[PDB]
Amino acid sequence: AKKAPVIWVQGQGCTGCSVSLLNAVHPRIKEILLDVISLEFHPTVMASEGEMALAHMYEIAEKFNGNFFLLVEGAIPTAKEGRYCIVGETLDAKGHHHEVTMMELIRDLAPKSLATVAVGTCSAYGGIPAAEGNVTGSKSVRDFFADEKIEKLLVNVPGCPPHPDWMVGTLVAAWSHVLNPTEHPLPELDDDGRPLLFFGDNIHENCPYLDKYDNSEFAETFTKPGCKAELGCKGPSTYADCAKRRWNNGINWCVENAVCIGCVEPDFPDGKSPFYVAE
Amino acid sequence: GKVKISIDPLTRVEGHLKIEVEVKDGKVVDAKCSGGMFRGFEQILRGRDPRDSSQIVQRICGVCPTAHCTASVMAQDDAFGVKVTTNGRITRNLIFGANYLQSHILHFYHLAALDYVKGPDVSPFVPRYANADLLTDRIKDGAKADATNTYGLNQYLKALEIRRICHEMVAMFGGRMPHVQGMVVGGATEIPTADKVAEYAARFKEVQKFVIEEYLPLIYTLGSVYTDLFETGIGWKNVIAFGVFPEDDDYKTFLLKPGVYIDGKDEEFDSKLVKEYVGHSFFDHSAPGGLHYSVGETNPNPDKPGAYSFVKAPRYKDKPCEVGPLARMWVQNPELSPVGQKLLKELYGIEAKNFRDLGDKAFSIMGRHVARAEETWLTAVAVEKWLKQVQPGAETYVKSEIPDAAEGTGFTEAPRGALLHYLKIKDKKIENYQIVSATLWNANPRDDMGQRGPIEEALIGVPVPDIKNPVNVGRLVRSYDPXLGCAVH
Ligand code: SF4
Ligand code: SF4
Ligand code: SF4
Ligand code: FCO
Ligand SMILES: [Ca+2]
Ligand SMILES: [Ca+2]
Ligand SMILES: [Ca+2]
Ligand code: NI
Ligand SMILES: [S]
């Protein structure tokens, strides 16, 4: 009956995790919003703005204390006292304005949540904003929780972006657990806090090109037949179910089209780069 | 008698935006636009294999990643010295064109429409402003108000599926979406097959039907209710466009041509005259006077006295210029859709053949929405043509090698406006990479000479008769379809 309350916050994100969620099927996004979750705060799509939006977010976090999912899209920058990501402004009772940093927001909301779900490689692992050359002290949710000594149930759903099936599936599994924990145990997580349901399979082991790989039949260029290994494919070092699930309602996937770039992995992008050089 | 209104977060845009206005005598009299989130892609990119840039830059934005990918692979093509095949060019246009459709539809419905349409009484459609001046408030005939609101809301809901189908179309030759795999230096990674062209076409016809039969009629109907919104949100009336969707192999002709319109006069676009100022932005420049992007610098400084935004301030010949569908449609001046020609006559008593026939009405809140809808139709006509031109089986990829030392620039138009990526290579690695994006031109702060950015300037004069429900401020801002991820990168 009751929908899962969700507060969805964005740090150093690109909105691509949100857009990927909009691509969900079975259920589609209309059914997700009207039947599955109560999306209480989401900066990209919600009706209210500014003071009203923030007041609503904090009201839900209070009313549904210990009973909402905090969804985090994007990384948390810690340099310069958090000032590389300002998420809003709060107008106290005297008229003075105070900016809220992503650090401050997560520190505030995470202890109020039932669980935090880091969607996307940015929030889960740091991803591109935390890659070599950045000067923002960009940090993952798990690292920020560790630094802050925040003990809150945390599940990572990585990918850049994650497949909507991974996000929806994980949230539904979490909510089912809360509603009946012995009938619905929490999904088993790997050492990097991501569900084995979606991230247990190795791409390469499950790849339809594996017969070609075994016969040393390698594509000389993108538009030639063969395994994609010599073009830079990171399938061998990547764990996701893309080979089975494919992308955009089964239309295509990275390996058929081009190469896997290892987007779900905690070392994406630096440990997967250069993208067009073989592993 | 001035009152300050501060809106942070300004929601239903992409990314982190703050808007501050001062209101006096029922109108905005000053404004400040602030982007509050920085990642520094231009720093992150340094030292990498230049080919990685077309994957890394897409993560600037998950709404418009194909635009960044396009600009990046074109910069790489230029730097690497490789010429794309006819079929590669067309395939890149089909990948990118499908997302133009997705982005405009996403914008109008899922970002803009809740300033006009009353949604159901569940989150995230509520809470909302108490006096929101919606269709249900404006239209005094209650049955007509209900019917028109339901008409708009049903389109909003249907558009959720239409935009998803657009991403099936992007994935067809792009691999997945957000963040395609199918565009690379040298062309595109998957040759279209007859079957996949037909599958793209079948989906496209459904999107096209929605555009012509639902979206265009809703926009013109909406404008006929909010005629006051064609008379405000004006701004500088300066626009720039770089050219998008090359229609031949030498990139001399485009669906929408490059050009500049400043102070009532058309001129050619000269990339030498673009520069960025940082006087009110959180960045340090090594030299005064603004910097051309080919010597651009990204040295963030959140402590810079007097600065208020992570967005730099691009100027063309020292003039603020806006970008986006209004800009492109004004510069190209294409013929209006048959729907637009008909409904402008029927609902407004306006005789209009070409975009410029809208005159002053183009440079307004509703004018920006009309431009975007018309451009959606225009792009669909083009995609329909490209689907006939694409040749199953014809090579889409040409080999290349990373040069030791080179430079290249990719020019295009993202759905939100003019986009370039500048790439300098040294020792086979990225030495400098500079991005001048669409919303960067719209949502920038004041330059060193105090000239307001286009959104800031367009806010001047916007009516705010109810300070507790300042709905026209957000309506103006959202008419520009801002993306702050792109603006700041
Ligand atoms: S994980 Fe990737 S798609 Fe999601 S916010 Fe980060 S950059 Fe964007
Ligand atoms: S294409 Fe990639 S994942 Fe598939 S067999 Fe080859 S290297 Fe492995
Ligand atoms: S195939 Fe590789 S790059 Fe593509 S979504 Fe799956 S893990 Fe990410
Ligand atoms: N469209 C789009 Fe994104 C912006 N602004 C880019 O480039
Ligand atoms: Ca602590
Ligand atoms: Ca500050
Ligand atoms: Ca830049
Ligand atoms: Ni964008
Ligand atoms: S795009």
Automatic annotation (TrEMBL), chain B:
Ca(2+) binds at E42, I435, H489. The keyword Calcium applies. This is Nickel-dependent hydrogenase large subunit. It comes from Desulfomicrobium baculatum (strain DSM 4028 / VKM B-1378 / X). Its main location: periplasm. Belongs to the [NiFe]/[NiFeSe] hydrogenase large subunit family. Keywords: Calcium, Iron, Magnesium, Metal-binding, Nickel, Oxidoreductase, Periplasm, Selenium, Selenocysteine. Mg(2+) binds at E42, I435, H489. GO terms for molecular function: ferredoxin hydrogenase activity; nickel cation binding. One of its GO terms (cellular component) is periplasmic space. InterPro entries: Ni-dep_hyd_lsu, Ni-dep_hyd_lsu_Ni_BS, NiFe-Hase_large, NiFe/NiFeSe_hydrgnase_LSU. Ni(2+) binds at C61, C64.
